[PDB]
Amino acid sequence: PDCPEVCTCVPGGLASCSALSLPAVPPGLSLRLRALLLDHNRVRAL
Amino acid sequence: VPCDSRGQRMWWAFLASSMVTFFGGLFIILLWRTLWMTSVKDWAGVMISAQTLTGRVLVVLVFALSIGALVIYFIDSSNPIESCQNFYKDFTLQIDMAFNVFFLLYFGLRFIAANDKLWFWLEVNSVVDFFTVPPVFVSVYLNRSWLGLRFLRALRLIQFSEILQFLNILKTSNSIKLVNLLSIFISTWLTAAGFIHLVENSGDPWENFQNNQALTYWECVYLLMVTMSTVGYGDVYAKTTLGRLFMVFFILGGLAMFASYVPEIIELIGN
Amino acid sequence: VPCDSRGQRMWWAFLASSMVTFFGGLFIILLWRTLWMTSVKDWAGVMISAQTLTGRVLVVLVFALSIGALVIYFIDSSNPIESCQNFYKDFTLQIDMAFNVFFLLYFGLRFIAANDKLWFWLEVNSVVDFFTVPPVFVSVYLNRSWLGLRFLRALRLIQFSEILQFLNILKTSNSIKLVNLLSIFISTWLTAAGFIHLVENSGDPWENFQNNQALTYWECVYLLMVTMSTVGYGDVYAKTTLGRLFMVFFILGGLAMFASYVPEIIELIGN
Amino acid sequence: PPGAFAGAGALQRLDLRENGLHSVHVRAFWGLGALQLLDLSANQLEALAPGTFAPLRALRNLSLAGNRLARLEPAALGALPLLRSLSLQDNELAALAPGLLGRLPALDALHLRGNPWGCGCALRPLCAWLRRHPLPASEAETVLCVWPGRLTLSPLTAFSDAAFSHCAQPLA
Numbered sequence: 202p203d204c205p206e207v208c209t210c211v212p213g214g215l216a217s218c219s220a221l222s223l224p225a226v227p228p229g230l231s232l233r234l235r236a237l238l239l240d241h242n243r244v245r246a247l
Numbered sequence: 248v249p250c251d252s253r254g255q256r257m258w259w260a261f262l263a264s265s266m267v268t269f270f271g272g273l274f275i276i277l278l279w280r281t282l283w284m285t286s287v288k289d290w291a292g293v294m295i296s297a298q299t300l301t302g303r304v305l306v307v308l309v310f311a312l313s314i315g316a317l318v319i320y321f322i323d324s325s326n327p328i329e330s331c332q333n334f335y336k337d338f339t340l341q342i343d344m345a346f347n348v349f350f351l352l353y354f355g356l357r358f359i360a361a362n363d364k365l366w367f368w369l370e371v372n373s374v375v376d377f378f379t380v381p382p383v384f385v386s387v388y389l390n391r392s393w394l395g396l397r398f399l400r401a402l403r404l405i406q407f408s409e410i411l412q413f414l415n416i417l418k419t420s421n422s423i424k425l426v427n428l429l430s431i432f433i434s435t436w437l438t439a440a441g442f443i444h445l446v447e448n449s450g451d452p453w454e455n456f457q458n459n460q461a462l463t464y465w466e467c468v469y470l471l472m473v474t475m476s477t478v479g480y481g482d483v484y485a486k487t488t489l490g491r492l493f494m495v496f497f498i499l500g501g502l503a504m505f506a507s508y509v510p511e512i513i514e515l516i517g518n
Numbered sequence: 519v520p521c522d523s524r525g526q527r528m529w530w531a532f533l534a535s536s537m538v539t540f541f542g543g544l545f546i547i548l549l550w551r552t553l554w555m556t557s558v559k560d561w562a563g564v565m566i567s568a569q570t571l572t573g574r575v576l577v578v579l580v581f582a583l584s585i586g587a588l589v590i591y592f593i594d595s596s597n598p599i600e601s602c603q604n605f606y607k608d609f610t611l612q613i614d615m616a617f618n619v620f621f622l623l624y625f626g627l628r629f630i631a632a633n634d635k636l637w638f639w640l641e642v643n644s645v646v647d648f649f650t651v652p653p654v655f656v657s658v659y660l661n662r663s664w665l666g667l668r669f670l671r672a673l674r675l676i677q678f679s680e681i682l683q684f685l686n687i688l689k690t691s692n693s694i695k696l697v698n699l700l701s702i703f704i705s706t707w708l709t710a711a712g713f714i715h716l717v718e719n720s721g722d723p724w725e726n727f728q729n730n731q732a733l734t735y736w737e738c739v740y741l742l743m744v745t746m747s748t749v750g751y752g753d754v755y756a757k758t759t760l761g762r763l764f765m766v767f768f769i770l771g772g773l774a775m776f777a778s779y780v781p782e783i784i785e786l787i788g789n
Numbered sequence: 790p791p792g793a794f795a796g797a798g799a800l801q802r803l804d805l806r807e808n809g810l811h812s813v814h815v816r817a818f819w820g821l822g823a824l825q826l827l828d829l830s831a832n833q834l835e836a837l838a839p840g841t842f843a844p845l846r847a848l849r850n851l852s853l854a855g856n857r858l859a860r861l862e863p864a865a866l867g868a869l870p871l872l873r874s875l876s877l878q879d880n881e882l883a884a885l886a887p888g889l890l891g892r893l894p895a896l897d898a899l900h901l902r903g904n905p906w907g908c909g910c911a912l913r914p915l916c917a918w919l920r921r922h923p924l925p926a927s928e929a930e931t932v933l934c935v936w937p938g939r940l941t942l943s944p945l946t947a948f949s950d951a952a953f954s955h956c957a958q959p960l961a
């Protein structure tokens with residue numbers, strides 16, 4: 202649950218999803234992740 | 248849990264609650280025609296007579312309550328036409344309920360003091376009672392509310408001149424006639440605007456109410472004033488089929504009424 | 519450092535500066551009624567009398583200054599309604615100030631020569647003085663400027679026919695009546711256009727003036743002419759609520775005034 | 790185009806994602822009812838003509854994720870008895886028409902994550918379906934709805950029959 206399907210996990214609650222072309226937010230959201238990276242993923246709505 | 252939604256339209260129940268009063272009781276009166284009463288008839292006649300003090304104060308009271316009901320309708324016209332609400336929670340509905348039960352009691356008292364029941368049943372006051380009073384009972388029973396034909400109480404404004412006459416405010420006949428004409432024009436203007444607003448904001452029934460136009464009551468008043476002066480800017484107009492039919496009928500009726508009332512205008516102008 | 523900005527609207531101060539003159543002094547006159555003067559009253563009466571030369575030249579002068587003030591308003595109508603300016607820098611404001619202090623002196627001279635102060639206080643000339651003269655003093659004090667009710671000086675066009683009468687230009691009564699009707703129609707047209715322009719370009723107050731429509735004065739004149747002829751193209755119309763209310767009131771008043779003035783038109787046509 | 794996949798009458802799998810589809814004509818799947826998987830995700834579809842999925846009969850799992858759909862007409866979906874799973878996540882759906890879920894028997898799997906659901910009387914059939922078919926706990930936590938006028942903290946599955954009590958059933 203702490204690791205998204207397409208993203209990468211780094212200890213310290215770091216999630217990296219750089220350059221994945223995700224249409225929206227990835228489903229891998231958890232309380233452990235203290236840092237989420239959603240740069241250049243072609244998201245258009247929140 | 249607390250939410251408000253339109254759901255299914257229930258206007259037909261409210262309309263039928265007045266139709267199955269009016270037409271059914273008219274048929275009952277007709278069939279009765281085909282097939283201490285004098286004392287109580289005289290008592291009711293002297294109760295509502297304009298000569299006595301009781302009749303004067305009572306007609307003043309019913310005029311004031313009609314003004315209050317018109318103000319309540321003006322306030323409530325800024326809401327969705329059909330909406331759910333709690334009768335115990337809101338007390339404005341309680342005020343309208345008290346006004347309407349007073350109207351019902353007055354209608355019964357008038358009906359007792361009627362030499363001809365059938366011709367009393369076709370009066371404008373009787374029909375406005377029929378199309379106003381049962382809807383509030385249906386609304387409080389069903390715990391919902393529909394805007395409906397609650398503007399028709401403005402048709403009691405025609406009595407306004409009479410309200411002045413026995414309070415020693417108008418003496419000459421010319422001023423009384425002028426006030427009567429002004430009150431008639433204002434009342435028919437307001438009720439025509441009420442029908443236009445209802446039929447425009449409600450939408451076409453056979454098209455699943457997808458033709459609704461966001462028109463406020465005062466915008467419809469402005470539209471009626473623009474139309475009756477034969478200006479017709481076209482900034483605001485009726486888009487629904489029934490609204491356009493009502494506009495055509497209102498144009499024809501207003502032209503006919505003005506042509507009929509020209510001689511009274513000339514008499515008021517005088518020489 | 520040199521910059522111009524609207525900032526906060528100060529129209530209410532200018533309007534109150536006339537309201538707390540008019541209504542407060544009316545109350546003062548009423549309370550005085552509840553609770554060498556003849557010589558000076560006669561002197562002021564003969565000073566402004568139309569028979570003497572002084573009265574003639576003085577009414578010609580005040581008519582000319584009213585024309586000048588109307589021209590100044592026409593020039594200034596092509597500017598933002600509320601704007602900051604320096605009184606010493608611009609001399610057109612100085613010209614308007616001189617015109618308005620002359621109007622104030624004339625109003626005082628008229629007020630001395632008044633048998634009934636209360637009925638003098640309700641004249642159209644008195645009320646146009648009240649709604650014109652204090653605003654320029656408030657503007658020069660606050661170092662700002664508001665367009666306001668400066669078009670009301672067009673209501674002094676009504677005396678135009680009289681201005682001809684004692685200059686040996688009009689002799690017969692028919693021509694005098696025709697000129698009077700034309701002047702009245704032109705003056706009411708111009709002042710109605712002035713109110714429409716002010717209420718349209720100013721915007722709705724309760725909606726933070728976000729309903730302002732860029733309408734020039736001459737476009738509003740065109741709109742009034744189109745409306746009063748019952749044409750109503752709809753290319754230009756009032757979009758604000760108060761503008762629409764004023765348009766409805768103007769339509770009703772114009773129809774009533776035309777219906778009242780029909781017999782004079784027939785008399786001018788004659789046989 | 791109509792009859793785009795003509796000649797593939799025995800087709801079973803069909804995947805169209807990341808293509809940016811924006812307009813699908815009605816009756817474009819003439820003879821494609823034999824498919825079981827249909828992926829139309831990651832596109833820009835906004836409206837679906839009624840009867841588009843009518844030729845489909847053997848379809849089991851359908852995905853419409855990541856689209857621009859606002860209103861889903863019941864006539865467009867029709868009745869698909871062999872359907873088992875359906876997805877509408879990451880969309881702009883506000884409410885579902887009542888009786889849409891009752892047309893088809895099997896709707897075991899449903900994903901509605903990320904849709905701006907405005908909880909109301911309209912959503913009550915969906916809440917009743919949640920009572921009949923409970924979602925996974927994680928999916929229940931993720932799927933929420935918007936409460937008008939206040940915060941959207943109310944979960945979709947937290948509602949009960951008390952909220953349905955406000956709705957006026959057809960009068961007897």
Ligand SMILES: CC(C)CCC[C@@H](C)[C@H]1CC[C@H]2[C@@H]3CC=C4C[C@@H](O)CC[C@]4(C)[C@H]3CC[C@]12C
Pocket residue numbers: 258374378396445446449450451452489
């Ligand atoms: C003269 C009066 C007393 C009786 C005449 C009946 C009139 C007022 C009735 C008959 C048909 C009615 C309409 C029928 C259908 C609808 C659609 C619904 O959204 C309610 C309003 C509306 C638009 C009704 C308004 C009132 C109506 C026009």
Ligand SMILES: CC(C)CCC[C@@H](C)[C@H]1CC[C@H]2[C@@H]3CC=C4C[C@@H](O)CC[C@]4(C)[C@H]3CC[C@]12C
Pocket residue numbers: 529645649667716717720721722723760
């Ligand atoms: C007959 C005259 C002398 C007195 C009547 C008062 C009239 C002229 C007053 C009363 C209310 C006033 C309006 C009230 C509010 C605003 C908004 C602001 O942007 C200034 C103009 C405007 C639109 C005012 C214009 C003048 C106004 C209409």
Ligand SMILES: *[C@@H]1O[C@H](CO)[C@@H](O)[C@H](O)[C@H]1NC(C)=O
Pocket residue numbers: 825826849850851874876898
């Ligand atoms: C639907 O498709 C197949 C059935 O062939 C299944 O393996 C898959 O997991 C299903 N998809 C979802 C999202 O449940």
Ligand SMILES: [K+]
Pocket residue numbers: 477478479748749750
């Ligand atoms: K016209």
Ligand SMILES: [K+]
Pocket residue numbers: 476477478747748749
């Ligand atoms: K016309």
Ligand SMILES: [K+]
Pocket residue numbers: 478479480481749750751752
């Ligand atoms: K027109």
